[PDB]
């Protein structure tokens, strides 16, 4: 909650050329964040993350054998958010969002979960949101991110052809293959005015007029894009103009992300 | 014949037990009251009216009878003695002396007896005498039956509801407050049957009567 | 001089509205005291069966009626599914359809009282009419075999039938609406074939061939209903009335005596209530009552294809 | 379920360019409505919409007007919740730009679209998106409430790009699927159909007096 | 005299004037006098009254009532006179002697002796601890200690305005005790020991339970000797 | 048929007959999030408690002139066991009846007469789940309340005991709670009396003393090493700051 | 912009081409009150009131009312 | 002093008078909470180690406007309830009793504004009362907002300050702080305006770079866990001159770094 | 020249020509055309233009060829009574009702309220504004009956439970009600009944008294008055 004359001083310094942020910075610099992983020993894989405004996400990774012929996605997100209703409109719109970025065509490589010409791997996605100040869409797509990158499964040793003849599979006892998947990742922006913002705060996302959401994967932009509304007392229409310049903007400053996450 | 009691339940201001055959309600009254904000009523007394069945839960075959149970209590009561006030109304079905999947009459008319007998046991304010009887008419013979068994009612074309209403020492009828008739019926069909149904329902009112005078007169000096 | 619109009269002062309009000879709802609404219809449009050389494939509505009476319009789809069948005029050899029935009047929410009730009603008399035989709803399934279906010309199951009802622009009581929608779209479904291929038996329904649902067609029945009012000498403008087919919020909120009947075009009647909470009832009222039903039920009948 | 009648439980489900109409103010019991249907070569679409507001909201006072979509399915259930809500929570972001919401304090508008007719005469959800936006724009046209423009959209391919100001603005972007490198053409064609829905919403209302 | 039943012929000559008492309703639309409830008809410048039945208390003008004490505002008490009922108001300048430095000492859970003095059919009800008509004050005010019985509403018309009801008498012959009467169907003892007061509470219960007042001494007697 | 307690004073894992699981707690672990908090690690069970208040009422009804209204809030995750689970346990009658078993047993302690006219709120996460998860919860509230500086009378310490035939084990894990019946306990300070007593299965009468005891014990325990714990965070926090 | 510029942009910016659905057919389809108002909708009066109570009604509102006659005092007072 | 934690047994001296943090059982006094002994003449009380801001008559608040209500607002300033503003609290720019203003509060107040304040009496349970009867407390304007923990507020006797670069702070005992352009009420300190919510219409580059940076080096200071007091905010912004970009100044090590250099210049 | 019909979106004249200012249903929107900023009055209703002369000239669009605010008139009804206020709900705000669908039969047989049915346990909070028939509330207090002598007003002398009154809104209040005014001649009761409401009509017949005309009974309100 912000007064009429705060509001005022934020915009009209956000709106300038160049740019003014609140704590100065640039228009594509990211805050400091924490990642730990691999510390719930029950599941295939986990993450959690840190923001420096307190913040914080939990990922788990568990998966099962199915049958991939009556099964048609293999991919599923389960989200769950601190204070919200299960039936949020928030809640719903992201779990949507999320299950559109990691279907089976989207760069995702599927062909990495198949055993037996018959079975498959499904992998379940749980996600717990413990505190959050804004629209925490790139909080979790950057923990998925990383607990995907962590994930171990158990390797099967029992036959691969059973079109004809088959036999129920059998998996070792100690062995576990890692998992080499492509994950996605998904960010946020913020339009105050004629300028474009990457990981916008709380309090600029309070003076924006617009956002958008654009989805990477592998060098490429990829397929999920939708308009979002960070406020409701300000929202306005954009130009033309801004679209291409913040898919640019993504397409330029993505790699430097990519290697902030990697081990 | 019935049987009925008067004031067997000890947290509310009026009860009552209605006994017909196999048919068994007990039903009770707590009023006046304070009403929530969204039952208010700014010049006359609210209404709250719950039937629970035998078995199971209550489903929408227990709407039906609360609906047709506030019909007939509304005019009743003098609910302008009582302005901004609750009333609330609750039946319990003990035993139903019919077979629930197909029909519901039997249990309508304890309910609405038992029902006028708590309000005259809470001591609420009404305008006249009720009195309630269950009609059908059975095949073959195309008798018209006052008053059916379970087994009658299996074999039956058509059954009826007949509540009436009335003043001047219950020999005078004010007004028909619910007539339910489902089934396959004619005019002449209809009209016999109202003509016997108010000869029962003057004889039952009497008994009613004589019920409540014996009842009521050791409570008073 | 001080004047008030007649939605606003209607909503500060009913009564006084209605009995205004009465001593006129007209109503606000600006009928007569007998007259009824208008009724038109359009049938088996949305089922899957509505083009008989183009079946529909992704469509799984076996029946359809769209009702227009007044500014109030009813849409009804019946749907259809099958049940395994383990272990006279008499009311144990007869069956019901189970409906749903919406009310939109701008609320998110669960069920009211209104399309409650409305739902139990319609189940209740469907199945006192005697009008669905439950011999009428029995299975003769058929098997396949190399591929190709053989119907003859073991385990047994029968059919079930759901009906979903939509009304939109309400502005008094529908059950007869609904009422007479339903017997509408009753008369127009069609039944899918069936076939076949601890166990597990599969029934499958035939792509495009059915069969018709047959009802017993002298037992169908229509709805009205009717009200009774008593004049006040003082609020006349420079004795009892009977009205039918009630409607706008003026009656609707001031008449508390009602009359409400099925009666079918044979002669006889399925239904009739009587509920007097104003005025009194007599029985010269409800032979009138009787007579307008009769002519109501015959106009509706015989009026289309 | 208490409240409704769903039969037997042990019972199994059976298993077995474009040319408009425009029409507003055909319901009683609300504040505004209309009636958008479509034909083509190979589709067919039939959509009622209707507007309940400006009423009294529970809670605590707030200065400016708040909005409400709700999306019902019709005849046959082809849609699931989630992308109901998600097509919902879109629509809400548009018309959070249009509507003029610091006239109407401490009140709420609520708008309600019925799906009722959806045919193939001869990616299924985001073709429907423009008849949507016509009809909640009709209705709230109907009904009197305060706008700053009139919004249209256009869809091409699976993209949807919804415009103001003779298709110099942008209120609302969506993209599913579709070629990666096909951004110019999908803004010229989404521009071009929302030149002739604009053109066809002015003249019903300017017509139906 | 009569039993009588709502919607009777009412019987009184329509000429005599009578002043309408309980049980009985003035039509408001025909201008018709009928009875509205179940009871014995009594006819007394006339007044004509039913007496019957009942539990529920509704206040009226110059009636005797006990109280709770269940809030505090900034210029009267709130008071409860029966659980459900809705409450009515207890003003701080309704004790003798009061002003606005002379204010009163009550605390939510008490318990108060009162009178009715307004009872408007549109508005709350207000109580006073005093006689206003008389200028009188005898016993008005917070009840110390004490046990609280429930009764119906016939037997404490009967214990407060009859001189002839025996239980009184009775039960001074057993012990020295402290009461008070309210006609909303509530009794205030006190004793000098708990048994004593038990002994009346369990006698007092054990009475109202029954309708024949000449059984009211043995009762009394079998109570005091359970106590030992 | 797995040897529960083997001839030579041995259970599965290697402990033996009157040894606890390996206890680890922290505190201040969400500064940002809430006025108090912990995190809990007992054998494998994983635990985030969240104190939030005293604070104003969100709704003027649930407001209390005389105390303080307390609540508390329970979530377990669906990937707190070996198989996930189907679907939600928010609305389940058993973790309601948890939250009340849990906001009666805490109301005693906590003095609420000294916070008019506000609220304290509790919310919890498990995250993983290995048994005698009843404990874990009463002790890791006791240390997120303690953290929060709200007065309190004493320690409440919860303890689980199992008895196989006739032999007592103490802190029982998942393996032993499948095999035999166990009860659980709430003890306050370092006294014999009881805030909870829970048992869901069949037990002797004649062989309940002996099981208490053996819990009473154990419960002491546990407030000893959360004690220790607590004194030893105090002591690093006043050192410097 | 000037004042002509503006306006030719007004009305540039200000232009739009002004120009058998069963379903729509279905739904979109096609004196004595105004003789009697301001009696049908105006306020109460009784049916039967003579016309000296009628006028005796009429006459008492064309006085001042409580509030007209203290605000006249209170003129002197506070000018 | 002396740490205790709840249930442990303080003293059994039967002459000591209990204060706040304690309960007794005849001659046995106990210890309701983890904190640490404190002893004036014969009064004996335990301090808590941690707990919310309490307020105390004559404090200086920063307070967001929370409820509008009857002739009165409710003021959120960090505390377990709200404070209250009456409305004779407060100055009225035409007057109070006019032949209005009190149907027509959200004119000059309304809910989310910000404010300052003093303490004027404690109600009977600790909620404060406020008042703003006076030139130097009303509407705050022409800045931006900042929060740190109320314990790192160093009680002094003057809480606003001029600082270099053309930059006011008022540092509120609550833990609210306000950051604006400096005007000339400030300068001077060394009508129907004071409820506008327009800003000056020219507030500079230079300045909100400043603001930026002030921000910055509280924040610093705060991650640091060192008292917050003027002389301090000076030379933590004097020493961060070395890196030319504001947005360097969130990392971190360079925040440790910051509060490490002020330990070592002043133990030095 | 002044267009003569306006929609939604359409320009209507600049600010200068004399300074125009916007008012009821138009509002004023920045625009770039051929790269140069323009200022314009835009229409955000369907209607007609008119101005007129407050230079300042204010710019409107008229519905034809609500929501209440402060200087409305509205008709109420009257709900509760207490010493110091009366409540109201509010039935029309300038002769259109509010709300159009009022609820009845929504829930079944009785004399009902809005929101004593079955269905108002199971309102969906958060997905909706208000329920089934709910309507704006107000608060006369008693200083605000009349405008003189407001220390000795009675309000059972004045209102009564289930009467029509005509009032002005005097503020919007909090969220649950607004302030309300009957101080003016034409400000009051213009609908009631005998025996608080369970009678017949009353007629009025002086500025503070009312007239039953079946039994020639008198009882007191606060008349507004009448042709």
Same mark, same amino acid.
């Given at each position: ?263 | ?65 609360? =609906? ?71 095949? =073959? ?5 006052? =008053? ?31 007539? =339910? ?41 | ?305 | ?209 | ?228 | ?241 | ?30 004196? *004595? ?38 605000? *006249? ?7 | ?268 | ?227």
């Amino acid at each position: 909650s912000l007064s009429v004359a705060e509001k005022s001083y934020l915009y009209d310094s956000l709106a300038s050329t160049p740019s003014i942020r609140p704590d100065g910075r640039l228009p594509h610099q990211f805050r400091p964040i924490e990642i730990f992983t691999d510390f719930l020993p029950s599941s295939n894989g986990s993450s959690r993350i840190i923001a420096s405004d307190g913040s914080e996400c939990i990922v788990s990774i568990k998966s099962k054998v199915v049958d991939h012929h009556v099964e048609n996605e293999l991919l599923q997100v389960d989200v769950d958010i601190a204070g919200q209703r299960d039936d949020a409109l928030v809640v719903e719109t992201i779990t949507s969002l999320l299950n559109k970025v990691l279907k089976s065509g989207s760069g995702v490589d599927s062909s990495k979960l198949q055993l037996t010409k018959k079975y498959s791997f499904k992998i379940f996605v749980d996600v717990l949101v413990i505190s959050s100040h804004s629209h925490p869409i790139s909080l979790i797509s950057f923990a998925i991110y990383s607990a995907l990158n962590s994930t171990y499964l158990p390797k099967l040793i029992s036959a691969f052809d059973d079109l004809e003849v088959e036999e129920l599979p059998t998996f070792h006892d100690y062995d576990m293959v890692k998992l080499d998947i492509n994950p996605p990742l998904v960010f946020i922006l913020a339009v105050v005015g004629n300028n474009m913002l990457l990981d916008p705060a709380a309090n600029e996302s309070e003076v924006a007029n617009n956002g958008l959401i654009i989805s990477w994967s592998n060098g490429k932009i990829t397929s999920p894009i939708r308009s979002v509304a960070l406020n409701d007392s300000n929202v306005k229409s954009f130009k033309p103009h801004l679209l291409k310049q913040g898919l640019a903007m993504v397409e330029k400053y993505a790699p430097d992300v990519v290697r902030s996450l990697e081990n | 014949s019935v049987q009925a009691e008067i004031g067997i339940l000890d947290h509310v201001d009026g009860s009552s037990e209605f006994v017909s055959q196999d048919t068994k309600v007990i039903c009770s009254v707590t009023g006046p009251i304070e009403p929530k904000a969204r039952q208010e009523l700014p010049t006359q007394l609210a209404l709250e009216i719950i039937v629970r069945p035998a078995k199971g839960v209550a489903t929408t075959r227990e709407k039906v009878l609360e =609906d047709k149970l506030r019909a007939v209590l509304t005019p009743l009561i003098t609910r302008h003695c009582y302005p901004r006030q609750l009333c609330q109304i609750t039946c319990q079905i003990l035993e139903s002396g019919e077979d629930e999947a197909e029909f519901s009459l039997r249990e309508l008319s304890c309910c609405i007896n038992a029902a006028f007998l708590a309000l005259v046991d809470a001591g609420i304010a009404l305008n006249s005498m009720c009195a309630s009887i269950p009609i059908a008419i059975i095949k =073959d013979t195309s008798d018209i039956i006052v =008053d059916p068994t379970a087994e009658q009612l299996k074999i039956s074309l058509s059954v009826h509801t007949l509540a009436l209403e009335f003043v001047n020492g219950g020999k005078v009828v004010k007004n028909v407050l619910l007539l =339910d008739s489902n089934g396959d019926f004619n005019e002449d069909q209809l009209f016999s049957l109202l003509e016997l149904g108010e000869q029962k329902c003057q004889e039952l009112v009497t008994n009613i009567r004589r019920i409540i005078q014996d009842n009521i007169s050791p409570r008073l000096v | 001089p001080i004047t008030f619109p007649p939605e606003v009269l209607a909503r500060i002062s009913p009564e006084l509205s209605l009995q205004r309009h009465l001593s006129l000879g007209i109503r606000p709802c600006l009928r007569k005291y007998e007259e009824f609404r208008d009724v038109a219809i359009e049938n088996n449009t949305l089922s899957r069966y509505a083009d008989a050389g183009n079946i529909d494939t992704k469509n799984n509505i076996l029946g359809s009626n769209v009702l227009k009476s007044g500014k109030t319009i009813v849409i009804t789809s019946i749907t259809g599914g099958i049940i395994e069948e383990t272990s006279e005029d008499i009311i144990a050899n007869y069956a019901s359809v189970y409906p749903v029935v919406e009310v939109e009047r701008g609320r998110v929410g669960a069920c009211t009282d209104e399309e409650m009730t409305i739902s139990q009603k319609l189940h209740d008399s469907i199945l006192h009419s005697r009008i669905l035989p439950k011999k009428a709803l029995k299975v003769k399934a058929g098997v396949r075999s190399a591929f190709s279906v053989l119907y003859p010309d073991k385990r047994k199951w029968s059919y079930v039938l759901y009906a979903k009802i939509v009304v939109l622009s309400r502005t008094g009581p529908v059950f007869d609406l609904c009422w007479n929608s339903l017997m509408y779209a009753l008369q127009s479904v069609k039944l899918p074939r069936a076939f076949i291929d601890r166990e597990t038996y599969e029934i499958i329904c035939d792509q495009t061939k059915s069969v018709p649902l047959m009802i017993n067609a002298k037992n169908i029945a229509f709805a009205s209903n009717y009200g009774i009012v008593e004049l006040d000498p003082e609020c006349q403008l420079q004795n009892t009335v009977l009205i039918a087919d009630l409607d706008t919020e003026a009656e609707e909120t001031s008449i508390h005596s009602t009359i409400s009947i099925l009666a079918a075009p044979s002669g006889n009647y399925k239904q009739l209530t009587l509920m007097g909470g104003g005025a009194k009832i007599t029985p010269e009222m409800i032979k009138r009552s009787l007579l307008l039903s009769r002519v109501r039920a015959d106009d509706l009948s015989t009026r289309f294809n | 379920d208490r409240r409704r009648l769903l039969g037997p439980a042990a019972a199994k489900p059976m298993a077995f360019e474009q040319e408009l109409s425009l029409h507003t103010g055909f319901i009683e019991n609300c504040n505004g409505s209309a009636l958008v249907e479509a034909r083509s070569l190979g589709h067919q679409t039939s959509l009622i919409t209707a507007v309940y507001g400006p009423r009294s909201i529970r809670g605590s006072f707030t200065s400016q007007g708040t909005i409400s979509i709700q999306l019902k399915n019709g005849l046959l259930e082809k849609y699931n919740t989630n992308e109901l809500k998600e097509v919902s929570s879109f629509l809400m972001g548009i018309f959070n730009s249009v509507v003029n919401l610091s006239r109407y304090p401490k009140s709420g508008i609520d708008i309600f679209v019925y799906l009722t007719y959806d045919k193939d005469l001869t990616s299924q959800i985001s073709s429907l998106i423009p008849h949507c936006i016509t009809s909640i724009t009709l209705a709230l046209a109907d009904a009197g409430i305060e706008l700053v423009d009139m919004a249209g959209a256009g869809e091409a391919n699976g993209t949807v790009v919804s415009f103001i100001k003779n298709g110099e603005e942008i209120v609302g972007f969506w993209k599913d699927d579709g070629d990666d490198e096909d951004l110019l053409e999908c803004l010229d064609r989404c521009k071009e159909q929302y030149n002739r829905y604009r053109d066809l919403m002015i003249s019903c209302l300017m017509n139906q007096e | 005299s009569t039993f009588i039943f709502p919607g009777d012929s009412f019987p009184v000559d329509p000429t005599t004037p009578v002043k309408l008492g309980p049980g009985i309703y003035c039509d408001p639309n025909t201008q018709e006098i009928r009875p509205v409830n179940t009871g014995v008809l009594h006819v007394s410048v006339q007044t004509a009254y039913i007496d019957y039945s009942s539990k529920r208390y509704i206040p009226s003008v110059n009636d005797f009532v006990i109280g709770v004490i269940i809030g505090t505002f900034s210029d009267s008490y709130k008071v409860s006179l029966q659980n459900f009922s809705s409450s009515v108001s207890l003003s701080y300048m309704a004790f003798p002697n009061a002003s606005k430095k002379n204010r009163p000492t009550l605390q939510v859970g008490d318990l108060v002796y009162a009178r009715v003095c307004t009872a408007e059919k549109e508005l709350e009800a207000e109580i006073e601890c005093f006689d206003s008509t008389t200028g009188r004050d005898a016993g008005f005010g917070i009840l110390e200690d004490g046990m609280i019985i429930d009764v119906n509403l016939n037997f404490a018309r009967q214990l407060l305005f009859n001189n002839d009801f025996p239980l009184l008498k009775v039960l001074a012959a057993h012990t020295k005790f402290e009461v008070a009467i309210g006609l909303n169907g509530k009794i205030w003892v006190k004793c000098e020991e708990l048994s004593n007061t038990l002994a009346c509470y369990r006698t007092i219960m054990e009475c109202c339970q029954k309708n024949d007042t000449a059984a009211f001494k043995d009762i009394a007697k079998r109570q005091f000797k359970e106590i030992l | 048929r797995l040897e529960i307690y083997s001839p030579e004073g041995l259970r599965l894992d290697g402990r033996r007959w009157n040894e606890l699981r390996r206890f680890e707690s922290s505190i201040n672990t969400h500064p940002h999030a809430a006025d108090g908090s912990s995190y809990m690690e007992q054998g494998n069970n994983k635990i985030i408690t969240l104190v939030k208040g005293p604070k104003e009422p969100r709704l003027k009804s649930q407001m209390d002139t005389s105390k303080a209204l307390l609540n508390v809030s329970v979530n377990i995750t669906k990937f707190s066991k070996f198989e996930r689970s189907k679907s939600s346990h928010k609305n389940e009658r058993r973790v309601l009846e948890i939250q009340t078993s849990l906001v009666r047993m805490f109301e005693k302690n906590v003095m609420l007469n000294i916070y008019p006219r506000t609220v304290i709120d509790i919310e919890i996460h498990v995250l993983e789940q290995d048994g005698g998860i009843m404990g874990s919860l009463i002790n890791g509230i006791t240390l997120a309340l303690i953290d929060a500086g709200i007065s309190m009378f004493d320690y409440i310490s919860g303890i689980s005991v199992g008895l196989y035939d006739t032999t007592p084990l103490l802190d029982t894990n998942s393996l032993e709670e499948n095999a035999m019946s166990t009860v659980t306990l709430g003890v306050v300070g370092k006294s014999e009396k009881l805030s909870l007593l829970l048992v869901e299965d069949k037990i002797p009468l004649d062989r309940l003393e002996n099981v208490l005891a053996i819990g009473i014990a154990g419960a002491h325990r546990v407030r000893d090493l959360m004690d220790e714990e607590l004194r030893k965070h105090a002591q690093k926090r006043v050192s410097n700051a | 912009l000037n004042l002509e510029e503006s306006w030719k942009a007004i009305k540039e910016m200000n232009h739009y081409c002004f120009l058998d659905f069963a379903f729509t057919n279905f739904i979109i389809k096609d004196l *004595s009150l105004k003789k009697h108002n301001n009696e049908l909708l105006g306020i109460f009066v009784p049916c039967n009131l003579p016309k000296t109570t009628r006028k005796v009604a009429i006459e008492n509102f064309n006085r001042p009312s409580p509030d007209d006659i203290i605000q *006249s005092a209170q003129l002197n007072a506070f000018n | 002093s002396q740490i205790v934690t709840p249930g442990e047994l303080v003293t059994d001296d039967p002459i000591w008078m209990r204060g706040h943090g304690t309960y007794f059982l005849d001659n046995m006094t106990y210890s309701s909470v983890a904190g640490t002994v404190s002893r004036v003449n014969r009064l004996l009380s335990v301090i808590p180690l941690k707990g919310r801001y309490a307020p105390e008559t004559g404090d200086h608040v920063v307070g967001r406007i929370a409820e509008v209500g009857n002739k009165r607002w409710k003021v959120d300033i960090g505390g377990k309830q709200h404070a209250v503003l009456m409305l004779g609290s407060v100055n009225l720019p035409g007057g109070i009793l006019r032949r209005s203003d009190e149907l027509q509060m959200r004119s000059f107040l309304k809910e989310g504004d910000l404010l300052n304040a003093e303490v004027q009496s404690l109600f009977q349970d600790g909620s404060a009362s406020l008042h703003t009867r006076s030139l130097k407390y009303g509407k705050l304007r022409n800045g931006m907002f900042c929060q740190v923990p109320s314990s790192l507020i160093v009680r002094a006797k003057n809480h606003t300050h001029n600082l270099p670069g053309n930059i006011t702070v008022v540092l509120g005992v609550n833990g609210y702080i306000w950051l604006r352009k400096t005007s000339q009420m400030d300068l001077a300190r060394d009508s129907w305006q004071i409820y506008s919510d327009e800003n000056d219409p020219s507030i500079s580059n230079n300045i909100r770079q400043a603001i930026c940076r002030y921000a910055n080096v509280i924040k610093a200071l705060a991650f640091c866990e060192i008292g917050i007091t003027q002389q301090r905010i000076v030379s933590a912004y004097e020493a961060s001159m070395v890196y030319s970009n504001v947005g360097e100044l969130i990392e971190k090590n360079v925040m440790e770094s910051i509060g490490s250099d002020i330990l070592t210049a002043e133990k030095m | 020249q002044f267009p003569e019909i306006a929609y939604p979106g359409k320009l209507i004249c600049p600010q200068y020509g004399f300074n125009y200012v916007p008012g009821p249903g138009t509002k004023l929107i920045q625009y770039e055309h051929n790269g140069r900023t323009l200022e314009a009055i835009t229409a955000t209703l369907v209607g007609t233009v008119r101005c007129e002369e407050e230079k300042n000239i204010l710019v409107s669009v008229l519905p034809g060829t609500n929501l209440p605010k402060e200087g409305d008139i509205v008709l109420t009804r009257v709900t509760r009574l207490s010493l110091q206020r009366a409540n109201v709900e509010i039935l029309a705000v300038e002769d259109k009702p509010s709300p159009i669908d009022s609820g009845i039969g929504s829930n079944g047989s009785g004399i009902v309220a809005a929101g004593g049915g079955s269905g108002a346990a199971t309102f969906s909070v958060s997905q909706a504004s208000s329920d089934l028939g709910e309507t704006f509330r107000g608060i006369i207090r008693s200083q605000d009956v009349r405008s003189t002598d407001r220390d000795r007003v009675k309000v059972i002398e004045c209102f009564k439970p289930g009467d029509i009154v005509r009032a002005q809104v005097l503020s919007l209040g909090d969220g649950t009600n607004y302030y309300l005014t009957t101080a003016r001649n034409d400000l009051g009761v213009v609908f009631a009944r005998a025996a608080n409401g369970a009678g017949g009509l009353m007629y009025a017949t002086d500025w503070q008294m009312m007239t039953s005309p079946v039994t020639g009974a008198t009882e007191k309100r606060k008349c507004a008055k009448p042709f």
